[PDB]
Design a protein around this nucleic acid. Structure first.
Length: 287
RNA sequence: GGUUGGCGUAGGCUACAGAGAAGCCAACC
């Protein structure tokens, strides 16, 4: 497995020792392992925040501030999704980010890399305030409009004649507290993750989990149809993909595809669909 | 191709909300 072919971290992992020598705010959070190598404890929210903020500055020229009480996005995963959206839409382009988080990372990356315009929505006060500040401090307010909404949905007032090229979304993966704790395992001694989940409740849980959340997005798409060229959603769980493709098929959606986002050990998936007859459909990963 | 059971990440491996994932084994259709 490999990251997306255009992902700048493919076969080029960041050099933590180089980053620590150049960025004192990163060096503050590193550890030295028993090989004498600069390393990170990815279970420490401050360390992973420092890494993400430092990568965005050094590699993308973006300065962001984010809280420890909300999700800390990881750059290679988010880039894998941006590059897949480039493939979908055939890369002025306009997108919608549903639930943009405190980092506003998808709009910041898309506007910086490709000059895309974004409508970026958020339901959480803390995430909304940080997202607005991160857009403003990177001088991207002309390209990115951050809006506070009551629900994560495509059926918004901010939408009437502008046709969007795409939507993207990181849906809340989990339906309940046992799922969010990761304890639904065959064996109690299953190794724990190397990461930590700092997400807020509206970032990580939803009624019915990502399966029911994405079904609601699908039913929103059945009302909007051609208002957006491509609909897309990340999936945190492999077992969500088949039931969601079958929901699209039962509802008669003509064009459907999917992909895998590969980075580290944690895989993510994503689903995309369209009602247009013109668009080319990117192939899913080979069998 | 599929279904079911078993195994599978403790970072002396640079993560990616670990998805029991990537994989591996057996058996049955």
């Amino acid at each position: 497995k490999s990251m997306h072919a255009r992902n700048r971290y493919k076969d080029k992992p960041p050099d933590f020792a180089y980053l620590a020598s150049k960025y004192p705010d990163f060096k503050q959070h590193v550890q030295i392992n028993l090989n004498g190598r600069v390393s990170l404890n990815f279970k420490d929210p401050e360390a992973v925040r420092a890494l993400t903020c430092t990568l965005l500055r050094e590699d993308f020229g973006l300065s962001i501030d984010i809280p420890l009480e909300r999700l800390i996005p990881t750059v290679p995963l988010r880039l894998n999704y941006i590059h897949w959206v480039e493939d979908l839409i055939g890369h002025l382009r306009r997108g919608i980010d549903i639930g943009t988080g405190a980092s506003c990372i998808y709009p910041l990356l898309g506007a910086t890399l490709n000059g895309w315009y974004f409508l970026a929505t958020e339901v959480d006060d803390m995430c909304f305030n940080y997202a607005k500040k991160n857009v403003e401090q990177n001088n991207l307010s002309d390209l990115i409009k951050v809006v506070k909404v009551p629900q994560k949905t495509l059926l918004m007032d901010a939408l009437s004649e502008i046709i969007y090229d795409f939507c993207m979304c990181n849906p809340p993966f989990f339906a309940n507290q046992l799922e969010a704790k990761g304890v639904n395992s065959r064996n109690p001694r299953r190794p724990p993750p190397s990461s930590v989940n700092t997400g807020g409740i509206t970032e990580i849980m939803a009624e019915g989990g990502e399966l029911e959340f994405v079904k609601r997005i699908i039913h929103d798409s059945l009302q909007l149809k051609k208002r957006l060229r491509w609909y897309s959603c990340m999936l945190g769980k492999k077992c969500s993909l088949a039931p969601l493709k079958e929901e699209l098929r039962i509802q008669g959606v003509p064009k459907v595809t999917y992909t895998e986002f590969c980075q580290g050990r944690t895989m993510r998936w994503a689903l995309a669909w369209s009602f247009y007859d013109d668009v080319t459909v990117p192939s899913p990963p080979s069998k």
